[PDB]
DNA sequence: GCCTGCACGAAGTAAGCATGCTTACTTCGTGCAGGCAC
DNA sequence: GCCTGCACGAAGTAAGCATGCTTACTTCGTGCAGGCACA
């Protein structure tokens, strides 16, 4: 029934009892491990060393049990299986310790362990009821454990005297103890074998086990009474008790060492303490008592229920949290009156939801609990049944309204489903769970037969119906047939082109379904495009494939050049290999011309004119005038960093100083030509849009209405365009009718910055500081962005360090790695030894790689 | 900006115009492909064959353009770029076809293609304004296209007469025609070069391009007027027209063949039709109009909006669906009055939700749309801001209530969050999007600072907080610290044991967090258990690992035997390899003894006594009596199918007959021993529970309350137990307060049958028919279950054919495969040739394998 | 609750998977500056 | 006036991944028989 015990001793006594109980638990764990070694291998079974180790563990367990509660007052209200052992020990002549009188019973340690706050998940089991392999007489052993005779309890199998085992009758006759006829009949059988089970004794004597044992008191009849009568007349040997207490601990550790030695011999592996605890738990798990302890521990940890109330609930409901969650509050209070309503709500989520989220009374909620078990039960129950229960007076108004609102909300939470449509769906198909099942079964026509179920309702209910119906030519019947045939939009997409054609789908429909419109731009037919998508994934990766692999499979060189986006001036100049290599390494033809030299381009196989075309238009215009020379033009462009602006923004005297092989007479002409070019630059696109042009641009971007709204709010379309150019996001948003979508339509990058989690003011500041999100990515530093008032997460997301930061790296180190290695993929493929040299942890590098 | 034209002709005329326009599109695609081949490779550029092919394509394009609208009435309301070409051609003296007069202008084909319902995604471009490489005179070519002179338009470059090209003035002098001084000044320049651009003509003559060209009518001034005056006076050559119509199509296919021949030479790959369409799209993307067309087609395909209204919306909003979805119905009707409210709701999901799901008026919804763009805007807007707008009279009551209900629902959809708590959260943190962001940032204390936010609210909002706080010793501060440090419960779980210990977590806490309770039962410490979970996933897979791999990594043989659950009589008999093999193949030691023979067990390395122990206890008891012999005992057990019951249920005369080698004297004693054994069976277990025992069993199973309710409803606990034993699921469920959970608590297998989707009556019938779900799986047939009223899906789910049915196989064939090959894994590893012999398709076997 | 391994059966439970919101891997369409000219 | 080349960045698309939820995938509960062995 109930196991409980209260500790009334001091803190020192509490710690002493804790240590004693833990040592006894270790001893009994040694007992159990020795029994497991006995049963595991017959080779170890045929070994007296294992048996002597087992018996030594039993003796140490008995000693530590005798050492429990020496003052016989540290514990009170000791209850085992419902029996109050306090009063029972009070009604005895010799009295004694109720804690020890409980520990001599099986599972009685559950009462003492609760009084000492021992972690029940370690299973602190202490049992002293060994009979077969007990080196002592079983009843004498139990009586010594009860009376706490540490002096008489041996700690070594060799210290066991025969007067306590085989020749036990020697000890009785030594103290002149009166014996009745029943105890004489017990002794006449015990003389044959002192380890005879009490069941066999009661069978042969024609009595009950209770009659054979008797009360554990000298003033009774039975073997327990006889051994108590013998023990009480024995004086306490304080010296021997002190010696056993001093010796038993090191002896226990020595027994553990011997156990590990025997395990490493017969099994070639040791039995760890955690393995012993887990095996003890696996053994005890078969018992409803341990299931109750586990349920109470879960109620304490997860739901925060008090220990006593959690134990009461676990006892009353066989340790079934699922059953407690379907039990009404009135029954919970009947079984455990100390339970609080808040604890009942925490354990019963249905009750909690009904009370708090719906304002129901406890009884009104218990109504729904009794009638439908859970919220899932309410969602599965038919609305007609609920209405009938309400009409018949069997369901209260509050509970009925709550159930109807729940069933309706479960459907109205979807887009396009109103209250009327949800009620019609409930009338048509019983319950929202049935509606969900019909949607899973793709019963699209059956769902659309109900009034209110439109295209939006179908898209929100049936998964994949939106993706199918959004294709031209595919109607509702065709989408339903495809879904029911293949088993989901995923399977329809995984289907083959030939079978999709067998279903009657157009090649355009199959292309739109499989998303291979670009792959069919690269490759002629749909079959090979689908094969490429299956093999490599995306057309982007297909383009990223190397030149040799692309020439394999069956692509021409011109096809590969079109795939990799090789320009004409780079395709017709070199071969495909070197052209694609240069393109993949530098990105742009202008970057090629800036990095690689004219002589290098010539050495790679370029025409002296094609090499100049690969060189910048600045180089081309330089070579146009007289007295240039390719190397001198290269030197000039490296001095002005390939920039006609910086070339013209210089005096010819300064120009002749920077360059190594050039005179003033030529520098004058060079600066003149550069200034002529920059004069031809204002004659290009220097015009800033006029009023009508800004008006038309606004009407294009945000529409006629919002454009007129902006023009009326501010001065004119010119002022609106000025605000747009200066990225006045806040001043644009303050206009009624102008929102984030319109601002992002006007201000480029605002949408990306908002998706990154930035406030409009933060996006405005970042744009005013850097220009665009591209320049932010290829420039902004984490310290700069922190000085702009941004958080580290926003900084990582806007710079692209999202994956590296998710790999448990700070923004600073992620930015350093990305800056050293170039790309995030390059950091992920970076050398592990190089990362270790940088100073990253092993687990950090493992997370980076995975 | 607007392109439109309406077709009023009959079905035959519609098909004729469709074919003519498609052939003209093919001809212009050939033109563009020839130009692409000219510019792609200089080797192909230096080839007159490609130029001749290009000119033939141009001539065929001109012919097909002349062949459009022969009756001059098939089209009406022709509008191109805003100009009404119907009225423009009506105001001319010669009249003509407005469709043909529009196609001579750039992009005018967009008007004609809409009248023929041609898929605009193919870009049906037709342009007849070639100047440089035009084999004919450009203005004469355009005028022939204008007046539809298919007879005068040549179909072959060799058929081109010089009087239509170099010596074009010969054709003018053939018809005299009066000419004015401006056209004479144009002719004096055209004599120098007939292909002089109109820009150059207007530049040299000091006039405008419009003044040089003139109206395409004889009653005007310009080169167009002159050529029209010349052409009108030319009689129609019906014979040449009919011959050209008969000849041009096959000529076009021949030109396509020549184009593919030239492409396979200079590029080693052909130009597919889809590639040509994509290149046309890439060219036309610079004309921005295609952006509008794509938006209109998307509005047609997804939301089912009419073509004209979709085009109007895309024009008015620059083809931005995100912008149209944020535009109110009033503005949508102002820009496109033909739009319907249902189409506006379909395109604006916010408007649809406000109108239908919330019962708002169109104006009340346009209010919220103007003020907050979208439902996301409302969720991002502060409740204080909405209340202020309502108080100041700037927001209507209906719109205010709708916005408040939306903001509240977005939070109350979570468990534990009531209306009061949602309102308090809105007051505290502005908006539900801010609440969601705070929950993502693990601001657990900041959220709990609000009244009403309890443990359930925290568990429902913060993901993983429940999993963390449900562990003993872990408090709110520790859970918040762990979440904010690692970045989610997933990362906390992926964290290492050493760093979790560095955070101060107990080993028990780390075990409960990582779910390594079984792996730490197999292996001693936590580090190796976590490594095993990382490498293999689950202890189940660790057990499934082979013997060699298990001996690797560092497991002992006894450890492997404990892992694989090898019995003692099978572990001590053979070696680990053969023991684990036999166990994985047969399951139980009794199955080993029944299948394998005594001689086989001996051949595998078993002791003559260990082989008998591996054999059944029936075999052991048989060998107990005298004069048996192991082979004779095997024969007896094979005769009685290893069943002492069937052995005792026989006469010794019948016993001596079945086995081939046994006498009557021995059969008598065998039957005697078997009957003695079955007599020793009735004293073991047979007691049908008494009344008090049934009462206690009910109190254990369904609880005290429901047990007493059942005992009162029915006769007694005995009757309740009878109902349970006979699986009276319906008769138990009819009791108020008894539900599926209690029934499954009483009736084993009911929970599994219900999770399989079976109604309680179906589960009751299946249980009454078969006994248990185990026997259903190991016995029930699909035909039997269909006769029991079950569906094929339920049959598959209850028999375990779920994966095979998901592999697009019917239940009958899936059951046949599972019966023949045993297991689903065996069907997967089955021979592909054997499956083909069975008669499965290639794709079917592929789906089985994958 | 002798005691737990051996075996089976079933959902208890927790690993593996479907699902829906989120987020750029990938599309994919736009803007614009030079460069030869139709 | 096209054409090519590159930069830009939003979501059109389509995978990424968190977060919930199935079910037998993985664990847990029960009966029994003979050995660890007792009400
Ligand atoms: K080359
Ligand atoms: K606004
Ligand atoms: K806790
Ligand atoms: K062996
Ligand atoms: K009921």
Author numbering:
A (entry chain A), B (entry chain B): 3 to 852
Show the paper's wording.
The 38-bp DNA oligonucleotide was redesigned by making it symmetric from the center, with two abasic sites, and still containing overhangs (total length per strand 40 nucleotides) and led to a different crystal form. The structure of the symmetric oligonucleotide complex shows that each DNA fragment binds two protein molecules with the topoisomerase active site accessible and occupied by DNA. The two monomers are related by a twofold axis, but this axis does not coincide with the DNA sequence twofold axis creating an asymmetry in the DNA structure. The structure with a 38 bp oligonucleotide revealed that the noncrystallographic twofold axis passes through a base pair of the DNA molecule, making the 38 and 40 bp molecules sit asymmetrically in the complex; one half comprises 18 or 19 bp and the other half 19 or 20 bp for the 38 and 40 bp DNA molecules, respectively. This asymmetry translates in an asymmetry in the path of the DNA, even though the protein monomers are identical. For the 39 bp DNA, the dimer is almost perfectly symmetric with the two halves of the DNA identical. This is not the case in the 38 and 40 bp symmetric DNA complexes, where the DNA is different around the abasic site in each half. Despite the small differences in the DNA, the protein is identical in all complexes.
Topoisomerase V is a unique topoisomerase that combines DNA repair and topoisomerase activities. Topoisomerase V is formed by a small, ~30-kDa topoisomerase domain followed by 24 tandem helix–hairpin–helix (HhH) repeats arranged as 12 (HhH)2 domains. HhH repeats are associated with DNA lyase repair activity and 3 of the 12 (HhH)2 domains have apurinic/apyrimidinic (AP) lyase and deoxyribose-5-phosphate (dRP) lyase activities. In addition, a 97-kDa fragment of topoisomerase V mutated to have only a single AP lyase site (hereafter Topo-97(ΔRS2), see Materials and methods) was used in all crystallization trials.
